[PDB]
Design a protein around this ligand. Structure first.
Ligand SMILES: Cc1cc2nc3c(=O)[nH]c(=O)nc-3n(C[C@H](O)[C@H](O)[C@H](O)COP(=O)(O)OP(=O)(O)OC[C@H]3O[C@@H](n4cnc5c(N)ncnc54)[C@H](O)[C@@H]3O)c2cc1C
Ligand SMILES: Cc1cc2nc3c(=O)[nH]c(=O)nc-3n(C[C@H](O)[C@H](O)[C@H](O)COP(=O)(O)OP(=O)(O)OC[C@H]3O[C@@H](n4cnc5c(N)ncnc54)[C@H](O)[C@@H]3O)c2cc1C
Ligand SMILES: CC(=O)Nc1ccncc1C
Ligand SMILES: [Br-]
Ligand SMILES: [Mg+2]
Ligand SMILES: [Mg+2]
Lengths: 486, 483
């Protein structure tokens, strides 16, 4: 019952810290989670949100959804078949995803078995005191203690949870959690939200809808994918619309009622209505702090609800740290993992390292997908006197032949024009998430535009466009956009 | 007519040089090529080998071949359709490719039309004297003179040409040039060679082969794709085999004869026999210097037939330069382009610059593909006391579900273990050519393994493997491998 490190949440951040502490520094590690494998009732499990109801199953489902485009696009390359025989079997996809995720859950059980000191505990972690975590049978703090763990160090890694707007009929709606387990593909679906989860799921549902199907994505403001490059936001909107998805912007559900046939009658704030089979809310995720009983030891939360941390993931309470989505910053698996790896290399390695939250490569598995690293030009323009924007945008040749002429590839490099330093790279098109990874390494190395354009292209690729841009398309000078420098 | 620059060959390097000299440096420029659009009889044409019978059309055709895998792989993700209705219409692929290539031909025609001081001459360029290019009707130097171009400066940019082994039946075999114009997809084809062109065409033919068809690749040496990472050579051999391609290593054609039905009867040096509809020779490309009459000016050639150049692309004759494949160095379009730009910057800009032929990112559009930049470990181990190999090899998760369990992604980083400097990155799997591009920029910036590992992954990707390797898999110490 005595551990160097007790981790609450066997997720992206929690397991990296757990496994590292044990294998690298022969530390004695306890990890708590509420469930050992994916799905209802608690959805996240051993492996965390990404593994169970996040990056992993989503990527499999987007890959499945991509075949709608491949099957059509093949005809341009001379592939012939009975188009009238094509069916998308959602049930097959969900059974395949379930088996793939279960194998990962079991893979992690294997890890915790084949690794000394590293031990898993099942049930709900909360803080008794500075150096004791209690594992209960439920999230009710009045339920039975299963174990009481002694810890020289406590890591909060409980991740996040979908936010459900408190509207009349919210109980008729789902989150991404339930989306992963729908027994049938919805004919008509409303994805609510303008973020990556709503966009990715609109693509998934769009590919698997039965005949006479319709995917509607609504977003409360004017343009989806706030925080992404503006050119790409407008382009993804176009490319989703070109593939049959209806984008309702400046619209937001005010209430949902059940129709007598079990379908959902959505009333918008604007007074518009829409009947759908599924309303999937994807309006935000919020840190999971409630259940930890942080009041007991007085861990400070933020004006937003995330565990407040310093650059070393340290709470106001010594020996207590927080990584990943509970900190309510960048909600990404590799950031959680980076933070856990840094926390452990610091505390147990005696080799203090802090996660860099700048110049983080990330993606949206939209069809086609986004790959991005570093600053969008609007943000660059407010920090740097002179910003240059290099832009190349064209339908790649293969997509003129494929018949998907609407698949414009967008490559944008944003620089500090004073020294040529690359501040951000923004890609939209097939392979963008793969292209951007090594760009993250370039930005860590303070790559300039001349490092890109003096590197020899790989031909033919979309990526080589990044090594072909010598001349700014336009500038920001003290915030002001203009074609030419003064 | 008198020009600041005359370019023989309107190809990757020749057009970069001529356009740059004309537009950036305001020189009067002549460019010569033998054809204004793709295909027989001369195959290459305005635009070069890559445009007409290389990178551009082959990438379109590999993209076409990939649908064979997508169609099969769709089933794992629940896609259903009538498999027995599936046909790979090669005629449609070829017609689509020909239109794409002709559009590029037309756009280059328009470029010459619209760019003052940049003039195109049709026919066969050769050196009359060190300041005179003669353009003639045919490759025969006694053919009719169409033009005589006076040149302060002459650029040789005629590219390379398929090598055909002087064997009995050579006339019954084709090269990549003819492969691009086969009217019908061969049922049975032998690709001869272990290089990228043989492997890439084996994958193209494997996808479009009619029912009961068979693609065979043959290579003299023990393992295809010499020059590439050895783990990738072995894995790409396994993955081609898994997709139904017969890889015959340590085998070479001795002769070819016609079966009575016009099919090709192949006798290998081993006494094995194979009957095929097509024999495609992809055993090497040689520099195209024969037709240039370089003996008229005494430009120094290698016994091979390449034009010898310094690092600034200068021949032994002042005012005569050579770039691209004719130099028989790195036969890649972007290298030819880089050499042409560097030459023109040096000569007309007084901006002295030489092409770095190290750490050049390149790809093989095999199925699945290869992306690579910098040194393989065997080469690094000879030039560095201590070399570290970081290796990750895993059947990715989409490929458990897809049914292509054989499709292992291989990511390998080779370092100078003394300082961590990355010497080489080698990738096999979907996306590798796209991933490796920005790795080229990393190696220009002297990235170390710590710069990869400390970079935050993009998840889920294959690329994030590059940023997830903390610890060497093995080492070379003084040329010796140590586990
Ligand atoms: C639909 C979706 C798609 C996503 N796609 C991507 C993507 O493509 N790429 C990407 O980088 N990120 C993606 N993310 C984000 C990613 O899932 C998270 O950033 C990541 O999982 C956060 O890791 P973490 O360590 O903070 O916690 P998590 O991985 O969320 O782990 C938290 C764990 O703690 C457990 N837990 C919670 N409370 C308790 C308690 N009291 N006691 C015990 N255990 C508890 C939970 O059961 C859970 O397993 C996606 C998220 C979602 C929802
Ligand atoms: C099948 C194949 C696939 C390839 N794939 C790739 C790939 O994916 N990526 C890559 O980077 N590289 C690839 N390459 C290599 C690339 O095509 C060459 O490296 C590049 O085209 C060489 O450029 P260059 O300027 O040297 O000559 P070229 O582009 O070959 O141009 C030479 C030109 O000169 C003309 N010519 C020749 N003799 C004369 C004469 N006497 N007078 C006038 N004109 C003449 C020819 O008609 C031709 O247009 C491929 C090559 C082949 C054969
Ligand atoms: C590749 C790399 O940087 N690895 C590393 C990072 C931190 N601490 C130890 C190691 C071995
Ligand atoms: Br060999
Ligand atoms: Mg254990
Ligand atoms: Mg002109």
């Amino acid at each position: 019952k005595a551990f160097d490190l007790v981790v609450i949440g066997a997720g992206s951040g929690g397991l990296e810290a757990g496994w590292n502490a044990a294998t690298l520094y022969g530390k004695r590690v306890a990890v708590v989670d509420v469930q050992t494998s994916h799905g209802p009732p608690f959805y996240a499990a051993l492996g965390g949100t990404c593994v169970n109801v996040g990056c992993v199953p989503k990527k499999l489902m987007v890959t499945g959804a991509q075949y709608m485009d491949h099957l059509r696009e093949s005809a341009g390359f001379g592939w012939e078949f009975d188009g009238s025989s094509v069916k998308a079997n959602w049930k097959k996809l969900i059974a395949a995803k379930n088996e793939a995720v279960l194998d990962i859950n079991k893979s992690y059980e294997g890890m915790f078995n084949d690794t000394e000191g590293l031990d898993f505990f099942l049930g709900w972690g909360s803080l008794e005191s500075k150096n004791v975590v209690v594992v209960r049978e439920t999230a009710d703090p009045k339920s039975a203690v299963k174990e009481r763990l002694q810890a020289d160090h406590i890591l909060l890694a409980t991740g996040s949870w979908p936010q459900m707007p408190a509207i009349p009929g919210i109980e008729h709606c789902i989150s991404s959690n339930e989306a992963f387990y729908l027994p049938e593909p919805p004919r008509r679906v409303l994805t609510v939200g303008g973020g990556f989860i709503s966009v990715e799921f609109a693509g998934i549902f769009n590919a698997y809808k039965p005949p006479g199907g319709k995917v509607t994505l609504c977003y409360r403001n004017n343009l989806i994918l706030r925080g992404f490059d503006e050119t790409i936001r407008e382009e993804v909107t176009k490319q989703l619309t070109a593939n049959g998805i209806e984008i309702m912007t400046n619209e937001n559900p005010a209430k949902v009622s059940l129709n007598t046939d079990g379908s959902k009658h959505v009333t918008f704030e604007s007074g518009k209505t829409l009947d759908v089979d599924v309303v999937m809310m994807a309006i935000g995720r919020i840190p999971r702090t409630n259940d930890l009983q942080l009041g007991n030891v007085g861990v400070k939360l933020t004006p937003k609800g995330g565990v407040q941390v310093d650059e070393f993931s340290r709470t106001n309470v010594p020996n207590i740290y927080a990584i990943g989505d509970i900190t309510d910053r960048l909600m990404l698996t590799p950031v959680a993992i980076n933070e856990g790896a840094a926390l452990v290399d610091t505390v147990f390695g005696n080799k203090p390292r802090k996660t860099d939250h700048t110049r983080v490569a990330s993606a949206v598995f939209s069809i086609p997908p986004i790959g991005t690293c570093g600053l969008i030009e609007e943000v660059a323009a407010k920090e740097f006197e002179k910003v240059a924007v290099y832009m190349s945008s064209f339908t790649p040749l293969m997509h003129n032949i494929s018949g998907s002429k609407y698949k414009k590839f967008v490559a944008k490099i944003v620089t500090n024009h004073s020294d040529g330093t690359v501040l951000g790279v923004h890609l939209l098109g097939d392979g963008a998430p793969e292209i951007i990874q090594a760009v993250g390494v370039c930005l860590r190395l303070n790559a300039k535009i001349s490092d890109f354009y003096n590197t020899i292209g790989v031909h033919p690729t979309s990526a080589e466009e990044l090594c072909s841009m010598r001349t700014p398309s336009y500038y920001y000078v003290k915030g002001e956009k203009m074609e030419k420098l003064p």
